[PDB]
Amino acid sequence: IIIATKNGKVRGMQLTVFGGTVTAFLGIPYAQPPLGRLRFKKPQSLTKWSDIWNATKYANSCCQNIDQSFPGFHGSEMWNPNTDLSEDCLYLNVWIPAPKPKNATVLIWIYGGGFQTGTSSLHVYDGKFLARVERVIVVSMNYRVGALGFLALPGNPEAPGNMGLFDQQLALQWVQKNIAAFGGNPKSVTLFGESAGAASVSLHLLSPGSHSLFTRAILQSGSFNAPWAVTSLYEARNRTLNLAKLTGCSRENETEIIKCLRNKDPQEILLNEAFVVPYGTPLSVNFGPTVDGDFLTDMPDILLELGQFKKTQILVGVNKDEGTAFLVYGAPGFSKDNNSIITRKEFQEGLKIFFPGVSEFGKESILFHYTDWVDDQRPENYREALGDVVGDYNFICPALEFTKKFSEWGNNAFFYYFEHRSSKLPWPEWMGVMHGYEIEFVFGLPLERRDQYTKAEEILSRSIVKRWANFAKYGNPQETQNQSTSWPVFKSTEQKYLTLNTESTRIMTKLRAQQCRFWTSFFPKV
Ligand SMILES: *[C@@H]1O[C@H](CO[C@@H]2O[C@@H](C)[C@@H](O)[C@@H](O)[C@@H]2O)[C@@H](O[C@@H]2O[C@H](CO)[C@@H](O)[C@H](O)[C@H]2NC(C)=O)[C@H](O)[C@H]1NC(C)=O
Ligand SMILES: *[C@@H]1O[C@H](CO[C@@H]2O[C@@H](C)[C@@H](O)[C@@H](O)[C@@H]2O)[C@@H](O[C@@H]2O[C@H](CO)[C@@H](O)[C@H](O)[C@H]2NC(C)=O)[C@H](O)[C@H]1NC(C)=O
Ligand SMILES: *[C@@H]1O[C@H](CO[C@@H]2O[C@@H](C)[C@@H](O)[C@@H](O)[C@@H]2O)[C@@H](O[C@@H]2O[C@H](CO)[C@@H](O)[C@H](O)[C@H]2NC(C)=O)[C@H](O)[C@H]1NC(C)=O
Ligand SMILES: O=C(Nc1ccccc1)O[C@H]1CCC[N@H+](C2Cc3ccccc3C2)C1
Ligand SMILES: *[C@@H]1O[C@H](CO[C@@H]2O[C@@H](C)[C@@H](O)[C@@H](O)[C@@H]2O)[C@@H](O)[C@H](O)[C@H]1NC(C)=O
Numbered sequence: 001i002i003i004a005t006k007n008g009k010v011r012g013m014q015l016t017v018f019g020g021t022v023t024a025f026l027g028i029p030y031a032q033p034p035l036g037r038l039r040f041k042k043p044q045s046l047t048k049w050s051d052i053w054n055a056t057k058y059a060n061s062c063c064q065n066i067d068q069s070f071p072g073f074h075g076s077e078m079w080n081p082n083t084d085l086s087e088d089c090l091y092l093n094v095w096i097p098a099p100k101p102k103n104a105t106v107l108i109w110i111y112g113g114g115f116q117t118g119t120s121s122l123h124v125y126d127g128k129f130l131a132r133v134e135r136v137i138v139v140s141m142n143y144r145v146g147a148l149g150f151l152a153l154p155g156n157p158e159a160p161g162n163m164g165l166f167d168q169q170l171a172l173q174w175v176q177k178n179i180a181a182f183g184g185n186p187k188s189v190t191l192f193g194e195s196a197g198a199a200s201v202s203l204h205l206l207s208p209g210s211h212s213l214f215t216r217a218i219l220q221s222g223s224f225n226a227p228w229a230v231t232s233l234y235e236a237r238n239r240t241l242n243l244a245k246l247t248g249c250s251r252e253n254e255t256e257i258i259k260c261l262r263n264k265d266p267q268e269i270l271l272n273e274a275f276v277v278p279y280g281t282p283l284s285v286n287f288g289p290t291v292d293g294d295f296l297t298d299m300p301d302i303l304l305e306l307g308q309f310k311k312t313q314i315l316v317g318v319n320k321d322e323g324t325a326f327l328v329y330g331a332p333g334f335s336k337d338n339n340s341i342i343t344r345k346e347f348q349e350g351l352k353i354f355f356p357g358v359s360e361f362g363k364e365s366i367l368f369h370y371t372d373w374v375d376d377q378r379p380e381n382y383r384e385a386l387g388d389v390v391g392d393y394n395f396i397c398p399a400l401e402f403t404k405k406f407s408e409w410g411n412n413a414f415f416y417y418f419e420h421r422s423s424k425l426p427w428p429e430w431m432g433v434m435h436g437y438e439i440e441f442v443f444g445l446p447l448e449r450r451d452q453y454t455k456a457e458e459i460l461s462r463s464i465v466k467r468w469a470n471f472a473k474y475g476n477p478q479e480t481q482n483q484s485t486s487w488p489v490f491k492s493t494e495q496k497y498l499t500l501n502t503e504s505t506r507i508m509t510k511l512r513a514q515q516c517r518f519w520t521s522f523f524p525k526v
């Protein structure tokens with residue numbers, strides 16, 4: 001139950017899973033707590049300890065604003081931190097199979113949450129099912145989010161930006177130096193993540209300091225080229241200064257602004273993050289990745305376009321209804337508690353909420369592309385169009401474009417289209433196959449026959465788990481035994497992708513081709 005790591009010994013705990021055993025190491029620190037002088041700076045190396053570190057419970061989650069929009073509602077509160085918030089949050093978790101493996105492929109999870117929220121201790125990120133069922137080792141880490149993680153004064157090591165990305169990177173580094181002691185193969189490391197985590201994974205494909213820290217990559221519902229994923233240097237500065245004046249920390253020296261921001265309490269910095277932008281959206285990322293010239297050497301669209309990234313296999317995909325969850329966080333006429341049949345003027349009003357700084361002509365162009373109906377008497381027409389607008393613009397089309405352009409440089413790519421709505425899903429049926437609700441299938445929670453999934457869901461989760469682990473171990477997301485559809489590689493010409501569902505798993509081509517031509521060629525110009 002004790003493992004000697006390069007900075008000290010850690011005690012784990014035993015878990016009984018599906019009539020077996022998994023060894024969990026919860027809450028191992030991987031960096032100096034970024035407190036006091038260290039707030040806003042890159043993570044610093046952790047010095048040795050002599051005792052046994054008791055890694056027997058999830059550590060603190062990083063400071064963050066909570067989603068309070070639906071108190072008592074499991075659909076929202078399942079994403080809120082299930083652990084004490086604190087600035088002292090740089091910890092990671094390790095699940096290893098029992099008995100101890102000899103050279104196990106490692107899966108590293110990076111959670112999302114708009115780069116402002118999230119925590120590896122969530123129930124839907126529990127890595128014990130994967131370790132039990134597929135004998136991979138699962139690693140997950142907490143990284144700084146919001147201004148405490150991504151405040152940018154470009155060039156200034158007091159607040160250089162991308163700290164949360166560097167938190168992740170130091171964690172990857174920790175797996176490089178230590179995972180063999182747990183029986184993992186540091187040469188067989190697959191990053192996977194969802195939404196902002198997925199975008200984080202894609203930026204590690206771009207960052208040279210990460211190229212030697214992982215083998216392969218899996219991108220669930222996110223990528224760096226998404227419109228929400230990279231903050232400009234203009235707006236980062238404007239946001240850093242609006243935070244300064246909002247707290248009385250306006251100075252001229254710039255480094256003395258950071259020193260001033262370092263003596264505010266975490267709460268005061270969190271309360272003011274909301275207002276650093278004049279007009280926010282349900283997809284706002286007040287403080288996110290920037291081109292810091294350190295983690296990220298150039299604007300990522302250029303690096304993607306010009307082949308500047310780690311050459312390796314990727315697994316990419318999206319969910320059928322990425323956009324719906326955001327509609328009841330601001331769009332008029334929408335509610336999780338009715339069927340949100342909205343009118344044309346409500347739709348038009350919704351676009352003003354999702355596209356605030358966009359010209360009247362840009363908003364008309366969106367209306368025009370999404371409102372020539374196959375049948376113009378359906379009352380749901382505007383309700384579904386707005387969800388598709390948000391999903392296509394923010395998730396599906398950028399993921400497709402990332403995959404096309406990444407595969408143009410000769411690496412195998414696999415694209416999925418997840419379209420199963422979970423039987424237990426707390427949100428209403430009109431929200432469909434929502435953002436983030438493939439995650440529990442990936443982590444194998446339906447394999448738990450107790451907690452209420454249908455048997456079809458167990459089968460779907462069991463195949464996805466196999467496909468993910470085969471992708472991590474061997475670079476190829478096939479299920480070779482049960483007579484399963486082969487998953488073809490995604491090539492920029494055919495654009496074949498795989499649908500995942502409980503009924504018929506099928507090979508399809510050119511997902512949302514009409515919508516994505518509008519978003520990826522036309523709309524970037526308006
Ligand atoms: C770190 O853990 C050790 C041991 O953990 C406990 O013992 C395991 C066998 C398991 O049953 C866990 O769930 C337990 O929580 C701690 O050790 C003991 O320390 C107490 C001090 O009050 C001592 O009285 C006991 O005799 C020790 N042994 C046992 C078996 O309880 C140790 O204190 C922990 N370290 C820290 C810093 O909390
Ligand atoms: C760049 O920042 C200025 C400053 O902004 C404001 O102050 C912050 C502390 C915060 O409370 C924001 O909500 C404020 O708006 C932005 O300027 C203002 O713009 C709004 C409407 O656009 C206007 O009502 C304010 O009076 C303006 N204030 C000033 C001092 O100019 C500006 O919009 C930001 N740039 C961009 C591109 O959004
Ligand atoms: C669906 O509900 C929205 C939200 O209204 C709220 O939630 C409801 C479940 C109910 O408890 C209401 O009392 C709440 O106000 C409805 O939107 C409101 O619609 C009215 C009339 O159209 C309008 O005056 C309000 O401004 C709207 N409020 C918001 C926040 O948008 C909507 O009409 C409902 N639609 C259907 C088809 O039932
Ligand atoms: O993540 C975000 N922003 C965000 C997400 C993706 C891309 C860009 C920005 O903010 C958090 C906190 C505020 C509430 N939102 C909603 C959105 C959503 C989506 C799926 C499940 C639950 C929820 C709650 C989550
Ligand atoms: C562990 O294995 C190492 C080689 O790793 C392999 O190649 C990578 C790319 C993965 O795909 C993985 O499946 C392969 O096993 C050896 O160099 C190393 O010596 C081995 N060590 C032990 C202790 O088994």
Ligand SMILES: *[C@@H]1O[C@H](CO)[C@@H](O)[C@H](O)[C@H]1NC(C)=O
Binds near residue numbers: 255
């Ligand atoms: C800004 O303040 C820092 C911190 O004391 C100092 O080292 C630096 O020289 C100052 N620069 C200017 C231009 O005032």
Ligand SMILES: *[C@@H]1O[C@H](CO)[C@@H](O)[C@H](O)[C@H]1NC(C)=O
Binds near residue numbers: 481482
């Ligand atoms: C294949 O089908 C059998 C049904 O007996 C099931 O037990 C097994 O888990 C399935 N394997 C995969 C990888 O889906």
